[model samples]
Target: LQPPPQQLIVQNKTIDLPAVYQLNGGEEANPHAVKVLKELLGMLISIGEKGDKSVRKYSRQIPDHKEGYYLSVNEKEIVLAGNDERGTYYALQTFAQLLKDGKLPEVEIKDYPSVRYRGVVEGFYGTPWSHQARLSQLKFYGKNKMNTYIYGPKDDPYHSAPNWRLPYPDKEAAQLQELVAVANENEVDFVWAIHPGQDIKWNKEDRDLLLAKFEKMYQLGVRSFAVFFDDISGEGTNPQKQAELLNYIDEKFAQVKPDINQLVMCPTEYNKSWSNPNGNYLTTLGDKLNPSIQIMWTGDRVISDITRDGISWINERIKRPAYIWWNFPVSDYVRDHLLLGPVYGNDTTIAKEMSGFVTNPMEHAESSKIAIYSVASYAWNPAKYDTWQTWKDAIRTILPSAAEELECFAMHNSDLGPNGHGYRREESMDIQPAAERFLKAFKEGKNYDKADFETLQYTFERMKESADILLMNTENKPLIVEITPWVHQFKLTAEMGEEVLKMVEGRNESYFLRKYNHVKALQQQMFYIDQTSNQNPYQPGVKTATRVIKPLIDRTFATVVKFFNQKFNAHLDATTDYMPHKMNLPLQVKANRVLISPVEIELDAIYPGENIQINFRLSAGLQKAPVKFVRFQFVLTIEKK
Candidate 1:
């Protein structure tokens, strides 16, 4: 018979059972360790079972946190004393693997993690289909290795309730049910969140209304629940009032879920301390009522720690499973760079304490995948882990060819800025250089090191080059005209210039000025491109704030040239009777002339904060069999900002 993938054993029978649990640090803002625990256990079970569960099996959620499994032939059990989820998960993975083939192996499994609370935060508000698109994002998560997905207020399509202070539109119930159904099919857990103060005004009727929503969801298919009274304050809620709220949830929703075998409850004060402020709420609702209701704690700040303080708080009062609230996303909140590294605290130490980890990918979907997955993978299986490699693997799983390119762009480009975005304009300069390096690597073929900087530079540069020609080439007017509106939108959207060269040296006239102004204003207002690429242009005063902002303006101008060329080329290609066109002057020469013309023509420098609008007088004509549009292509260069 085949052995487990990593030789993990359970008891003397060479079983494949691996235990999973949470180690909560006493903090309201800390990350939950659930996703990490789940991933680790899944890996162990998959590897050990080797498609043969009879060969090995361990009980899920051991009798208690202390009585962990043994690794020797003696089948002894050890009470793990780790302080964090990473450590506990590692111990579990280690203990199981040490005793393969009914005997302990002559090997030592040392464990450690790089980040503290590796997780994600996600939130979105839009139409239902917009919400449905979130499922497509799961492929993004699974490939990137994100372990936890948070659901809150309108952010979650599945969540129909209002913020704890207010309720949702009374009519959206049916739509919400559909959202929950999609979540279950996608293997995404909904953190059935409730905002008591926001939903119910701190009254009994409000609590019941919240309970009613839970009951309805429980019937639909949701098994997870969390109470988020984020804005609740002493104005209408005192400590006693908060305790009552806790007691009410414990009785109605926490203890009442028939389908929910495991549940998580939040105390009113949102404290990391296991004990209630009055030291009375837990005793009333503790093990005496529903022993399974685990208390939820966030890390220190909204982004808290995974420390002994948290562990001690959980180990002392609530012996049940604990969850951490992690707020880190793989991408920076503002800059969309791939942030792949350790987070929060020491990963090697923190994994041992928690039972579960839940990340809040509160921003863009793609960014969350990088960091959340790596940390969760380690948090789940602390032993035998490679986070950086794991992140690379996850990235490739999504955009196989574009993975390295995107990651490289993310690294040098991940500079934090005042706009809450990361990566400065200086980072844009690296784009051409990086893309060049990427090309070099590809040219070297199989001989190049995939992880080396040269390869990344080569790949990125090539992408940029292609992007410039095919996607960013604005002078290819004919080509752009032939493509569908959406397709053209994609191409033009990649253009990132702030200025436009509407006319050539000999062709300078009112018509060129009109065309140039139209495109410039359109780019400024973010009209032609999709809304996602829309950025507030640098305002008049802020233009000189940093030298880095200037490239964006130049890049934007280069994009216009590419945009024109691409559209022109497409138009020419589609036409049977069209004059072959060549740029009399290089696009760069034309663009440069336009840049210097600002001084000669008395052009107004539009500030980024100002809104520039564009209108089209003519429509892109319909595609026919014979008659086609003319095309033009140009390689344009503009003056640097």
Candidate 2:
């Protein structure tokens, strides 16, 4: 029931699990279809030319429909029919969903993808998923009925290096071959994309070089390919030249490798704003390029709302349906933030207007699976898709036994926004009603309930426990390490909540100090925590925690500290200090210069005879400055110990 079928009819009749399930079109069907049936049913299944219609068991059929399936089950037998291999595989997947508790319900169902191309693009700007991760994702994509997996990680040298003509190393080439084989077995299109706009020349040699890369990938079992000109400087970029290069590849590939599905491109002017800026690049490229050559676009901005009008606007100029390269749940730019939320904001009706839809995922492959699952659900059947429900189902599917806990964690941390370079908030999970109530109570003092606070605390605790479970038990330990900072932040929030409860009960100055220091420490951790692993090429991990929470905490602490100081006459030290007289110095300070120093005074309590110590280190700001009449001033404020 992941991508819930198009039509379903339930019957009162039921039957015991059959010992042998027969696949009639196994010879021509995808092996993944057969494999999934055997794996999910956990029993021996027979595959042959055809199953007898009279047999009292399961049978697959190829009917006269296009990419659609008709699954019928009676008291004695179950018959699944499709018009093609993909449809048959989808039928099998639906059948797998119906198998529960060693029994099968007698029912009729029909299903097909509303969107022709539904899959993920590993095209984020960060360390790419390991080869093993890609292989595992192919299996996941296949199981979920997703049909594509575009290989376009931004940091992969083979994909986007300046030396775009160089061949992949032997080991990397072998890895790609393995990925292709896996994708083929799973019936997922492994689209190999190369980014060469950094230094690619518009000539026969460079065009052939691009072809050579594709030819090598074609030899390794790749049938889909994309050329990316995104994120390149416009200084040396030529729209007509780029279009010619793309058309050349399209023409040559069609002549040489007709089996190739379509040549795809990511234009330098990827967004609508950029495309329309000059009334130039996109129109020129669209006019010159072959219509069969697919183009990729990221909505209005790099990460912006995807509306029906947006897609329609782009298609009008492109002359073909633009393939959507959706940037969602992608945390490369916001490395500190994990976008474990459902895909939203995209107009459901817009699916038909696009050639394909590919979501860019985060660096943490296993964690990204949660968002990717929802993306697949939305892509497969967007009109009927429910974002929150899909997200809930994704959590359950991913962490079957710990769905509640994981959902809590995902919901709490689902604030998605631009990391930098744009004015768009990507997407976010809906704020929990309980969280909303608690926040309103905390601020307005209306509808305040102790039980609400307790519930919020419990929710955070569950997330903490879930994080612990994932860290201890999950196969991908590195993924857990990647998210540890966010997990710890959650724990810290829970602890801070407990301290707030103490504050509410009129805690002492020491207690207030404890809470103040706790917030300060948490803020520091948010800013400086090492959230990445040794394998991460992009260092100093995600800034989500720091970016989202730091300003709020700083503002809250400013008011709280002022209130506490005013009420208690507490001379609390500032978390961060600014010296108004301190001059901003240039990078190249002259040698033999003396810089003015801020004097520091240290005070320690003693039995009435204690002495305070003060130190100063001063230097001139300019070279060979006169050191005449250097003076220092000090003022002390006394308070009873």
For lDDT, the strongest prediction is: 2
TM-scores for all candidates: the values are: 0.48, 0.81
Residues 1-641, candidate 1, lDDT per residue (tens digit)? 00111234333243333353222221211112224323434212211111123113332322223212212222232222122332333344444435444344433222333322223334323211235445655433332223334555344433433443333454555555665565443334555565454334665676676677677756656676665544344443344454455556677766665655335555443345424546654344344435544555554343445566665565455554455655454222332122333333524455556656666442345344455555566554455456456656555543454555434433333333444322232333444454444335434433334444333334334434433343333442332222223233322323322113222211434564455555455444333232223122221100111223223333333443444456455221111111112222211112112111110122223212211112323223222222112222212121221
Looking at candidate 2, the ten consecutive residues that score lowest on lDDT are: 585-594
RMSD of 1: 15.6
For model 2, state the Cα shift of residue 616 in Å.
30
Q: Candidate 2 has which clashing residue pairs, if any?
A: 335-542, 336-542, 336-543, 594-619, 594-620, 595-619, 595-620
Highest TM-score model number:
2
List candidate 1 segments past 4 Å from native.
Answer: 1-129, 137-149, 153-189, 232-240, 265-292, 295-298, 304-322, 330-346, 383-385, 413-415, 418-532, 535-641
Candidate 2 runs further than 4 Å off: 20-23, 41-66, 234-236, 421-452, 475-478, 509-561, 573-641
